[PDB]
Design a protein around this ligand. Structure first.
Ligand SMILES: Nc1nc2ccccc2s1
Length: 246
């Protein structure tokens, strides 16, 4: 997250931190995700496509720090890693959505607590109007030029951009489809960045906090006329519903 503010997991208790174990034993951060039911985390396919083997991954819930344990956190293995079969990449990632079925070493799913909660899905084809303020959360870079990721979780606020505006040549042209959502700051001063992929774009939809988007792609970070692009969750409900019975 470029700009914005530090936070803790109590302010985004559905946030999942996803790591990969290497041969040799070293563990590195992959991407964010969101707990949508006790056994299911939703994220982005592009985070996993190069290493599609479920055994490679570790998921934490209730974690506020990147490389230290948070009191109360839960650690899970990935029982199933489900990637979208229509995924494609050209800048733009199409159908950039993934499901992780989580399972602890003891065979259990997430147990809700002060630091671990689920986020509601939107109803179909129901999104906030352009100009609406939403929140994004992640452990991604704080500056495009940084090498390190922040040790503490961050969040910021971005505003939804209409498809009409995002499709202008001077924005992203045809790279953006109707299954994607653009969001940015009016001054371009805050944005998602490398390492934020897979995490939640959350909007309040009729009084309910709702998973409107999943961090997917963008040209650079916090650049004029280059918004963050998000998988439009409300266009994938049948896919999510079918695959969460797996
Ligand atoms: N504005 C955005 N920059 C990035 C970088 C990596 C992934 C997602 C995004 S969205």
């Amino acid at each position: 997250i470029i700009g914005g503010e530090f936070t803790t997991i109590e302010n985004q208790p559905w946030f999942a931190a996803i790591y990969r174990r290497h041969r040799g034993g070293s563990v590195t951060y992959v991407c964010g995700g969101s707990l949508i039911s006790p056994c299911w985390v939703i994220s982005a396919t592009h985070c996993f496509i190069d290493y599609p083997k479920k055994e490679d991954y570790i998921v934490y819930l209730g974690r506020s720090r990147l490389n230290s344990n948070t009191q109360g956190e839960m650690k899970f293995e990935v029982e199933n890693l489900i990637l979208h079969k229509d995924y494609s990449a050209d800048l733009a990632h199409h159908n950039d959505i993934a499901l992780l079925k989580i399972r602890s070493k003891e065979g259990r799913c997430a147990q809700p607590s002060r630091t671990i909660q689920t986020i509601s899905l939107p109803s179909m084809y129901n999104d906030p109007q352009f100009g609406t303020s939403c929140e994004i959360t992640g452990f991604g870079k704080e500056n495009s030029t940084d090498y390190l990721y922040p040790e503490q979780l961050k969040m910021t606020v971005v505003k939804l951009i209409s498809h009409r505006e995002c499709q202008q040549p001077h924005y992203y042209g045809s790279e953006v489809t109707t299954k994607m959502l653009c969001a940015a700051d009016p001054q371009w001063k805050t944005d998602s960045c490398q390492g934020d992929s897979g995490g939640p774009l959350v909007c309040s939809l009729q009084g309910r906090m709702t998973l409107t988007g999943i961090v997917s792609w963008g040209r650079g970070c916090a650049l004029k006329d280059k918004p963050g692009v998000y998988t439009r969750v409300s266009h994938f409900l049948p896919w999510i519903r079918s695959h969460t019975k797996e």
